[PDB]
Ligand binder design. Sequence first.
Ligand SMILES: *[C@@H]1O[C@H](CO)[C@@H](O[C@@H]2O[C@H](CO)[C@@H](O)[C@H](O)[C@H]2NC(C)=O)[C@H](O)[C@H]1NC(C)=O
Lengths: 48, 49
Amino acid sequence: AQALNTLVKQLSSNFGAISSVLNDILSRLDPPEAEVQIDRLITGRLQS
Amino acid sequence: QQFGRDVSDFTDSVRDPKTSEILDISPCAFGGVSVITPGTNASSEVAVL
Ligand SMILES: *[C@@H]1O[C@H](CO)[C@@H](O[C@@H]2O[C@H](CO)[C@@H](O)[C@H](O)[C@H]2NC(C)=O)[C@H](O)[C@H]1NC(C)=O
């Protein structure tokens, strides 16, 4: 149960990127720089 | 209140701003697909799961 928590806590971590919600980097920044910060969320979540 | 959250911070329930109806939000659907086969020499038909 603590593994499934620890996986699911870190949905909320930004991993140093802009925001833990994708739509807030989608709707609010430039789609070039939106690609930058979601690619930091994609790899950071993929390490977890 | 206007909306609710699950055990995460994901939003699961919403008060409808047009009629104050309390709604719930399911996941749409997803899941895994498994294929069951008797083997290629004996047959070439499958069931899915
Ligand atoms: C939006 O508001 C209107 C009124 O501002 C709602 O109409 C009322 O609906 C209730 C429930 O059927 C009735 O008791 C009232 O007589 C209605 N009033 C009027 C002036 O029509 C309407 O229901 C609201 N929208 C939704 C989707 O519920």
